[PDB]
């Protein structure tokens, strides 16, 4: 499946794509404002994620650090990124279908649209001004808006034990972006697409 990753932000993003223990395609690429990157994701892939990283510093060998979404200090990501990260999440070819969503469970850094290239299902978007409205206690100094689990590290927010519910912090994300997961046990906003679809992930969407 192809994923067209498009940066329409005023700033550079270092795109990342991983399934947690390995890169998807090249794993990462610098996208200056206006640039795109098309990757191939293998059929049947489960637990894939695409995200933006902001304000990265890499040397000639591809090593350094990003202010948001850093993946072990590498340009070409193998593993998932450090919060805060708006997440495009997908599993493909599961019982004949693809499953896509956007998640704020690990916070928000860059606005995102995640849409199929086919008419057979509907895309999702979280592009509200979460960083500008971020409660002070959730603000990340390097940019972005942390989820409450990252900040407070309690089950109330991290949903590690029992059955967590909405909190004032999950509600902050949910009201701004109803179509994205706001905490682990949020009512699902996963979209079912025809199996073997292709997709576009747009940073800073408008139209």
Descriptive report:
11% of the residues lie in helices and 37% in strands. It is mainly beta and 207 residues long. The protein has a single domain (1-207), classed as Sandwich (Thaumatin), CATH 2.60.110. Strands 2, 3, 5, 6, 7, 8, 11 and 12 form an eight-stranded mixed β-sheet that branches. The protein is globular and about 40 Å long. It is classed as plant protein. Keywords: Sweet-tasting protein, sweet receptor, pH, plant protein.
Question: What would the keywords be for this entry?
Answer:
207 residues; mainly beta; Thaumatin; eight-stranded mixed sheet; five-stranded mixed sheet; 4 helices; taste-modifying protein; signal; Thaumatin I; Osmotin/thaumatin-like_sf
Task: Please give the structural blueprint.
Blueprint (H helix, E strand, L loop, with lengths): L1 E6 L5 E6 L4 E9 L4 E5 L7 E11 L5 E5 L18 E8 L2 E7 L8 E5 L7 E3 L3 H4 L14 H5 L2 H4 L9 H9 L3 E2 L9 E4 L4 E5 L4
Parallel strand pairs: 1-13, 8-11
Antiparallel strand pairs: 1-4, 2-3, 2-5, 5-6, 5-7, 7-8, 8-12, 9-10, 9-13
Family: Belongs to the thaumatin family.
Function: Taste-modifying protein; intensely sweet-tasting. It is 100000 times sweeter than sucrose on a molar basis.
Pfam families: Thaumatin
Summarize the structure in short:
With 207 residues, the chain is mainly beta. 11% of the residues lie in helices and 37% in strands. The chain has one domain: Thaumatin, CATH 2.60.110.10.
- Percent in helix: 10-25%
Strand content: 35-45%
CATH architecture identity: Sandwich
Characterize the quaternary organization of these chains: monomer
Which CATH class? Mainly Beta
Number of strands: 13
- How many independent structural domains? 1
Termini separation? 24 Å
- Give the radius of gyration: 16 Å
CATH topology: Thaumatin
- CATH homologous superfamily assignment: Thaumatin
- The coarse silhouette is globular
Main β sheet profile:
8 strands, mixed
- The tally of helices reads 4
Order of helices and strands: EEEEEEEEEEHHHHEEE
- Class by alpha and beta content: mainly beta
PDB class: plant protein
Keywords: Sweet-tasting protein, sweet receptor, pH, plant protein
Assembly: monomeric
Entry title: Thaumatin Structure at pH 8.0, orthorhombic type1
